[PDB]
Design a protein around this ligand. Structure first.
Ligand code: HEM
Ligand code: A1ASO
Length: 460
């Protein structure tokens, strides 16, 4: 069509698009397979169309640094709009340009290492809860699906960190927080709805005037009311995500609806993501028990006699840092990094026209043989103390990079590591007969396993 000749004029290789559809039919193998395929068949830079939207993929480390870090505030500042957002347009991950710079300033101190150290005791409290509910499942003599145990854990930390709500999600699935928040699963961008709106971006403004929100509106209105009630209910900082935005509420000021929007994004950002990575980590520990043994030995060394973890101790365990990093290399759940080019610009000898989405194939780079030897093998020694300097930080980007990287990286890493320390110091995980030995990945818009990971759990 009239927008499909762009990459031909610039002389950029890519699959030939179809009218009205672009290359979305090539998504039948999934985002990951499509990205790795184009990397093999086109080299270091290629292009394709999500409907009428042109997308340029870049793999040069210098270009990635220019897009994500150097020319970030000037050119590559925002992400592609993804659908009808409603009042959630004020969320930090959805805000654009000056509003984003303001909100990120108003929210950066919330994710300081100092504030994270003050959050460790609260998160550790539900590590003991996870172990208690894990032992009962171990006594059943039957395999357990890790998504439910970790999802229960990830919910308990989120509620206790975002608010003061202490809950046992696995045993108390009735509290209004547990019910509504359990409907904040990740967005399958290859489903009929999202595939439709990428082909029909003109329908996004229509959906907004019908008050059709991409987030379930019942959960949003419930959460807005609960925050409005809790603000009066405390009208003892307790290292509370909501409180840290209330005391900071008194650049510019953070509004009440803005505060509500950020709180929901933190719940959304850390419920399935935390549980998914924790499930991937345990799968690789079962199929590679030598790693699990050394990790279980390192946990006992730093924290003897099943000692509770600490900010100073978690940041000390080196082999635990290797297991999370290598799992995030194999399974970067974002799969991709996107920036919208807001003006004509030339980067590293390449012309990027206005309006083109620049894409960085994190999954494709993480499994590229030109940077990783035996990429499919899960060798956690890639990040040893003497081999962790060879890795290019712009090829391995599990949390993104630049001033729009993950704002909750330290929390997520701490939260996951605190969970791993407590569970491996009491249990061992064995591959049962209901476990997929190859672990086929899903073909949709999510980086999740095809079948849920079920493993045998024994007590130590
Ligand atoms: C293991 C879990 C997580 C992973 C793998 C992850 C990864 C990412 C990635 C790749 C991005 C995009 C950065 C880019 O565009 O360059 C991002 C953005 C973001 N993440 Fe996470 N994330 C995780 C958990 C969390 C959690 C628990 C929070 C809660 C505070 C959080 C808050 C955010 C925010 C606020 C952004 C948007 C930053 C901005 O737009 O300025 N993330 N994350
Ligand atoms: O933005 C992402 N997630 C996200 C989205 C929302 C929102 F939609 F409601 F606004 C809210 C929270 C998060 N969230 C999850 C973990 N931390 C932040 N990404 C990366 C990404 C995706 C697409 C384009 C792009 O440039 C960057 C992500 C991260 C981990 C797993 C899966 C994803 Cl899709």
């Amino acid at each position: 069509t009239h927008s499909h000749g762009l990459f031909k004029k610039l002389g950029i290789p890519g699959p030939t698009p179809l009218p009205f559809l672009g290359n979305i039919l090539s998504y039948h193998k999934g985002f990951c397979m499509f990205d790795m395929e184009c990397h093999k068949k086109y080299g270091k830079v290629w292009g394709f169309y999500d409907g009428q939207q042109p997308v340029l993929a870049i793999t040069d480390p210098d270009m990635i640094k220019t897009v994500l870090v150097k020319e970030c505030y000037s050119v590559f500042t925002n992400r592609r709009p993804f659908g009808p957002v409603g009042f959630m347009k004020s969320a930090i991950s959805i805000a654009e340009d000056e509003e984003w710079k303001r909100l990120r300033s108003l929210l950066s101190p919330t994710f300081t290492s100092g504030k994270l150290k003050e959050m460790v005791p609260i998160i550790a409290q539900y590590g003991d809860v996870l172990v208690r509910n894990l032992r009962r499942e171990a006594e059943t003599g039957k395999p357990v699906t890790l998504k439910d145990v970790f999802g229960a854990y990830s919910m308990d930390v989120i509620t206790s960190t975002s608010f003061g709500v202490n809950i046992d999600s696995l045993n108390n699935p009735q509290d209004p927080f547990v019910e509504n928040t359990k409907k904040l699963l990740r967005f399958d961008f290859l489903d009929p709805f999202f595939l439709s709106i990428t082909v029909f971006p003109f329908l996004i403004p229509i959906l907004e005037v019908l008050n059709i929100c991409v987030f379930p509106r019942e959960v949003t209105n419930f959460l807005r009311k609960s925050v409005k009630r809790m603000k009066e209910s405390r009208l003892k900082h307790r290292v509370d995500f909501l409180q840290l935005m209330i005391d900071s509420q008194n650049h510019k000021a953070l509004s009440d609806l803005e505060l509500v929007a950020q709180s929901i994004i933190f719940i959304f950002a850390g419920y399935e993501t935390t549980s998914s990575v924790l499930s991937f980590i345990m799968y690789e520990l079962a199929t590679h028990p030598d790693v699990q043994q050394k990790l279980q030995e390192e946990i006992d060394a730093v924290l003897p006699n099943k000692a509770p973890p600490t900010y100073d101790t978690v940041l000390q365990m080196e082999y635990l840092d290797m297991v999370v990093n290598e799992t995030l290399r194999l399974f970067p759940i974002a799969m991709r990094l996107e920036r919208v080019c807001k003006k004509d610009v030339e980067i590293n000898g390449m012309f990027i026209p206005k309006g083109v989405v620049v894409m960085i194939p994190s999954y494709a780079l993480h499994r590229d043989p030109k940077y990783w030897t035996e990429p499919e093998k899960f060798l956690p020694e890639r990040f040893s103390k003497k081999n962790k300097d060879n890795i290019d930080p712009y090829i391995y980007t599990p949390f993104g990079s630049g001033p729009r990287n993950c704002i909750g990286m330290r929390f997520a890493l701490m939260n996951m590591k605190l969970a791993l320390i407590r569970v491996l110091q009491n249990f061992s995980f064995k591959p049962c007969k209901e476990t997929q030995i190859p672990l086929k990945l899903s073909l949709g818009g999510l980086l999740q396993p095809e079948k849920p990971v079920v493993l045998k759990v024994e007590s130590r």
